[PDB]
Structures are given as structure tokens and as C-alpha cells.
Design a protein around this ligand. Structure first.
Ligand SMILES: Nc1nc2c(ncn2[C@@H]2O[C@H](COP(=O)(O)O)[C@@H](O)[C@H]2O)c(=O)[nH]1
Lengths: 180, 180
């Protein structure tokens, strides 16, 4: 089912936002076609982390992941960082060829930073380009403010709705901000 | 002079692709207004690096920076990374207030990472938003290919020419790819 036009959408949770101090604890992927139609949904993987890493999280993160249950899921997981990377790679490979899709989503420079340090082979499977929806949001804010203020932010507390809300944010801009 | 909706455009040259292992050897900036009108061109600075750093560059960067003149300009530079940062901030300070502008250019996630590592005072001067022209390049190649070819890009290896082309690539999308 491969197709170099298909897009790889990704969302990550981390113990914090610094790739040197922090680690990935959840990953999720969704492959669309070039026109934002879902082809398939990757695994949502909580990635095992030892207790020292888990206790080493700052205050805001310790609360947010604990109350979400991600901490407990991460504590129980038998899937390592490398194993999750391979699981996501095994899935992405039947839909998108190597170095074809950019990373798609929101705030995905930070995602590329973490993939670079912690999953270098998955980072390498993307085209080096970034499809970041917030570029369009930033342009809409300046040049067509009504299109951005008209977007209906969804719930996104779970990883696949999070990605789907980003895909729907691109749709909104394709429909109301992009002459085609 | 200052105006919080002015945009800071930046292009770097590096010794390699790792923002943490490699270094910055050239930088330039251009300030436009929020409608892509060039307000001012910042200085083009070659940054001195020890000879070992230049000899250690891979094959592509040895070729490319050798034949552009940059390798020789690096060797002959007496401007350290920090002085190039202070010189660029001195210019940008006249045109954009602190934290107002995103970082604008092509694949500027790579640029921000190098700045974050090597020029964190300059990185901190940008709004946290990334204004990535190549996000639109990928959307245009997928949703309206013949506006992606309407755009004439001279293979411009002078730093300011690379930036002016980036500003012109976004102009071409505001006109032919975006509805306002
Ligand atoms: N190793 C390597 N680096 C590249 C390549 N293309 C661009 N770069 C890096 O990108 C920098 C310039 O960014 P650009 O303007 O090409 O986005 C160069 O200084 C170099 O470090 C490449 O094909 N191989």
C-alpha cells in the first residue's frame, strides 16, 4: 500500500521538553493520503521507563502524566524505546517509503529533536522536511485572522484524537485558507 | 523603528547536520514587515572555526563550502560565534522587539536547533513559533503542483540571495497559493 505521497503524522509525550534531560514515554502515528484521508492508524505505545527517570520529571510533568495515567502505563510497559521505534517503523513501512514523508503535525520541530536523540532510525525514515500546521496558523493569524479564530479546537487528551485534531486543523486551512 | 509584527528571516551554513556535534560557519538575516516587504538586510558573517573543524567536514560539505569561498572565509574570519551573535542581535534589535517574530526561512527547524545550541541568546530573541516556507512547499507540491513550478529559484549560494529567495518563495504562495 506504499505511496511516496502519503503523510506520516506523529504525536509524542515526553517526561519534559529537553532531549538531553528527558525521554519519550508515548508515541502515536497516523498515515494519511496526500489529501488528509486516513489510510491507517499506528500503534499507540507507552514506552517503558525506569523509576529514576520517572521520579526525575519536574513538577508540571509529574502531575500531568500521573493524572493522565501515562506514568502508570509507562511503569507497566514492557516495550522499550528501541522496541517502540521498531513497532512504529514496522507499521509506517507498509504505507510510506523511506525519506518520502515529512514529519506532519503541530510543534513537530520539538518532536524531531526527540526522535533525533532517542529514535534516530525513525527520525531518518522521514524526509528531512517538516509539515508544521502552525506555519499556516501563524500566516492565518497575520493575513486572514477570521480563518484561524474560526477553528474548533477538539479534545486531544488521547494520542490518536490529538493527531486527528491536527489533521483536521490542516483540513480547515486547506478548505478556508488555500486556493486550489 | 521597532515593530512587533516585523519578521526575522535567517539562513545559516553549518559544518554538518548535527546541531550538537557540528557548528555554525555562516549566518545572515533580513527583516521584512508582516507583508514580506524588505525593511533591512543584516550583516553576512563568516564565523571562524579551527582548521581541524574544516578538515573534519564530510565530503559534501568539504566540496560545497570549499567552492563557495566559505571555507576560506571561515579560516580568515576573526569573528567568533559569540561576536557574530552579538552583531546579529545588534542589527535585529533596531527592527523587531524581543520575542515578537517567529524564525522565518526554509526548513528553519534545523536553523533554530543550531542557534539554540550555539547562539542561545539569539535563539531566545525569536518567538517560539517557526514560520517554515517549506511546509507550504510540500503542500503546494501535493495540492497545486503548478504553483510549485510557477516559481523561479536561482541557484543562489550567497547568503543574502538564499534569504531573498526564501522571502520570494513565500510571496509566491501568498499570491498564488493562499486565499485572503
Ligand atoms: N551533510 C550534508 N549537509 C547538508 C546537505 N545539504 C545541506 N546541508 C547542510 O545544510 C546547510 C545549509 O542549509 P540549507 O540552506 O541547504 O538548508 C549546510 O551548511 C550543510 O551543513 C547535504 O546534502 N549533506
Amino acid at each position: 500500500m506504499q505511496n511516496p505521497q502519503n503523510l506520516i503524522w506523529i504525536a509524542l509525550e515526553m517526561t519534559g521538553l529537553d532531549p538531553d534531560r528527558d525521554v519519550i514515554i508515548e508515541m502515536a502515528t497516523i498515515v494519511t493520503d496526500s489529501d488528509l484521508n486516513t489510510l491507517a492508524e499506528g500503534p499507540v505505545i507507552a514506552i517503558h521507563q525506569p523509576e529514576e527517570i520517572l521520579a526525575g520529571m519536574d513538577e508540571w510533568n509529574t502531575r500531568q502524566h500521573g493524572q493522565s495515567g501515562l506514568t502508570q502505563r509507562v511503569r507497566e510497559s514492557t516495550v522499550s524505546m528501541a522496541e517502540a521505534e521498531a513497532q512504529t517503523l514496522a507499521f509506517l513501512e507498509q504505507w510510506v517509503p523511506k525519506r518520502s514523508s515529512p514529519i506532519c503535525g503541530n510543534s513537530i520541530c520539538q518532536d524531531r529533536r526527540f526522535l533525533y536523540r532517542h529514535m534516530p532510525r525513525l527520525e531518518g525514515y522521514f524526509h528531512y522536511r517538516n509539515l508544521d500546521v502552525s506555519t499556516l496558523k501563524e500566516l492565518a493569524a497575520r493575513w486572514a485572522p477570521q480563518v484561524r479564530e474560526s477553528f474548533k479546537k477538539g479534545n486531544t487528551h488521547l494520542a490518536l484524537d490529538d493527531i486527528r485534531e491536527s489533521i483536521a486543523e490542516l483540513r480547515h486551512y486547506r478548505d478556508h485558507f488555500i486556493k486550489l
